[PDB]
Design an enzyme around this catalytic site. Structure first.
Site, PDB file in Angstrom:
ATOM      1  N   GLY A  18       0.720  -1.293   0.000  1.00  0.00           N
ATOM      2  CA  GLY A  18       0.000   0.000   0.000  1.00  0.00           C
ATOM      3  C   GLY A  18       0.739   1.327   0.000  1.00  0.00           C
ATOM      4  O   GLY A  18       1.121   1.841  -1.058  1.00  0.00           O
ATOM      5  N   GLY A  23       3.438   5.776   5.479  1.00  0.00           N
ATOM      6  CA  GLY A  23       3.727   4.503   6.131  1.00  0.00           C
ATOM      7  C   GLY A  23       3.779   3.374   5.158  1.00  0.00           C
ATOM      8  O   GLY A  23       4.267   3.556   4.056  1.00  0.00           O
ATOM      9  N   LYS A  39       1.207  -2.571   9.653  1.00  0.00           N
ATOM     10  CA  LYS A  39       1.137  -1.192   9.215  1.00  0.00           C
ATOM     11  C   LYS A  39       2.335  -0.535   9.814  1.00  0.00           C
ATOM     12  O   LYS A  39       2.724  -0.883  10.917  1.00  0.00           O
ATOM     13  CB  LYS A  39      -0.132  -0.513   9.724  1.00  0.00           C
ATOM     14  N   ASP A 125     -14.579   8.143   9.376  1.00  0.00           N
ATOM     15  CA  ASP A 125     -14.070   7.819   8.070  1.00  0.00           C
ATOM     16  C   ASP A 125     -14.713   6.542   7.570  1.00  0.00           C
ATOM     17  O   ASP A 125     -14.066   5.509   7.451  1.00  0.00           O
ATOM     18  CB  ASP A 125     -12.557   7.639   8.179  1.00  0.00           C
ATOM     19  CG  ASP A 125     -11.826   7.991   6.915  1.00  0.00           C
ATOM     20  OD1 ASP A 125     -12.365   8.749   6.086  1.00  0.00           O
ATOM     21  OD2 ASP A 125     -10.686   7.504   6.756  1.00  0.00           O
TER      22      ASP A 125
END
Ligand SMILES: C=CC(=O)Nc1ccc2c(Nc3cc[nH]n3)nc(-c3ccccc3)nc2c1
Length: 260
Positions: A18, A23, A39, A125
């Site tokens: 990603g 990050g 992550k 979100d």
């Protein structure tokens, strides 16, 4: 340091999937023969998310597993094989999703979000980018940053966007908006409306129209989602229940169509 913390070891990063914003997200293997999602990236700001995820567990919320609280800091959680619901609807497997599947997915997420209602938690979100798909058309909530015990305006409610007032009721707004993509095959809401146009338009009283091939059934629902008074908007118990029983109690005559 707590039970959620683990040695930086026993975890290596197999893959990188990603890093659009700040990050990285890889899919390794964990703690033996266990596949995980990690992550990476006020080093604490990053982990305000699992401080929240620590307190929440639900089967329709992606689950935390471990978090390496020290830099290089990481959050370990349950891997979901099919990326994110946005790419999924826009993309190749999205071609054959008709209403039944699309309504189904919806409910799972209402359902996780019903739970969020239980714990007095708010997600600021809710958007198909923050929902991850799995084998079996399993969808779970995610992106636990932004979440606290109780900023794109296409997906966000007015009171919040303008005045910072973020309820669960404002999460509810986002749910309606999300319904449309679910039924739009991933489209950006308010087509051809820019973030200024959207603001007083939406204040103007204006809601999106019935997506092509949608049932007005689901549209009065989204519409209920967008009510101007945050408190007359439905809830995730209601939505979840409405969503689940939908093709027996709601549109129990629905017939298959070309694009839905
Ligand atoms: C054909 C493309 C394909 O299968 N891609 C996949 C597959 C799984 C992804 C995934 N799984 C995750 C992330 C957190 N839990 N599970 N997570 C993510 C991801 C999630 C957030 C940010 C960046 C990437 N992407 C995935 C992409």
């Amino acid at each position: 340091k707590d039970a959620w913390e683990i040695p930086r070891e026993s975890l290596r990063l197999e893959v990188k999937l990603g890093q659009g914003c700040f990050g990285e997200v890889w899919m390794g293997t964990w703690n033996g023969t266990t596949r995980v999602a990690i992550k990476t990236l006020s080093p604490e700001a990053f982990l305000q998310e699992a401080q929240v995820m620590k307190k929440l567990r639900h089967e329709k919320l992606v689950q935390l597993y471990a978090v390496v609280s020290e830099e290089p800091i990481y959050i370990v959680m349950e891997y979901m094989s099919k990326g994110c619901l946005l790419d999924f609807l826009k993309g190749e497997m999205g071609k054959y999703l008709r209403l039944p599947q699309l309504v189904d997915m919806a409910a799972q997420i209402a359902s996780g979000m019903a739970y969020v209602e239980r714990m007095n938690y708010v997600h600021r979100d809710l958007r198909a980018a923050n929902i991850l798909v799995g084998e079996n058309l399993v969808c779970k909530v995610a992106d636990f940053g932004l979440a606290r015990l109780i900023f794109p305006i296409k997906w966000t409610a007015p009171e919040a966007a303008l005045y910072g007032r973020f309820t669960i009721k404002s999460d509810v707004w986002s749910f309606g908006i999300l319904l449309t993509e679910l039924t739009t095959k991933g489209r950006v809401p308010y087509p051809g409306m820019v973030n200024r146009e959207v603001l007083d338009q939406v204040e103007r009283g204006y809601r999106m129209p019935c997506p092509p091939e949608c049932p007005e059934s689901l549209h009065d629902l989204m519409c209920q989602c967008w009510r101007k008074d945050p408190e007359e908007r439905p809830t995730f118990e209601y939505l979840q229940a409405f969503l689940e029983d939908y093709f027996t109690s709601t549109e129990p005559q629905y017939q298959p169509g070309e694009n839905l």
